[PDB]
Amino acid sequence: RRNELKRSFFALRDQIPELENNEKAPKVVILKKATAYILSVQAETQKLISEIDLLRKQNEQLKHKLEQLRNSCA
């Protein structure tokens, strides 16, 4: 119904930090800023993934150095 459409616009609006609980936010703004927010959080996801990849590489290098020194301690 149209109750459900209004309800669903509110619920989407409220996952967008810039628009949460803004009673003056119109439909087209909610749709476009939601689309923008999805892209923005994907960008942040990519940064986190890159950070993990770097930490894993560092983890592997450290473990390699640890093994080398354990075998070279005398």
User: How many other CB atoms are there within 10 angstroms of residue 13's CB atom?
Assistant: 22
Q: Does residue number 6 form part of the binding site for Cl ion (CB under 5 A)? A: no
Q: Nearest-CA neighbor of 11 among 30, 37, 29?
A: 30
Q: Binding residues for a copy of itself, how many (CB under 8 A)?
A: 38
User: How many other CB atoms are there within 10 angstroms of residue 30's CB atom?
Assistant: 18
Window contacting K ion (CB under 5 A); options: 23-31, 37-45, 46-54, 64-72: 64-72
- How many angstroms separate the CA atoms of 66 and 70, rounded? 6
DSSP secondary structure code for residue 8 in this structure: H
Q: Does residue number 43 form part of the binding site for a copy of itself (CB under 8 A)? A: no
Write out the residues near K ion by the rule CB under 5 A: 72
Write out the residues near a copy of itself by the rule CB under 8 A: 4-5, 8-9, 11-12, 15-16, 27-28, 31-32, 34-35, 37-39, 41-42, 44-45, 48-49, 51-52, 55-56, 58-59, 62-63, 65-66, 69-70, 72-74
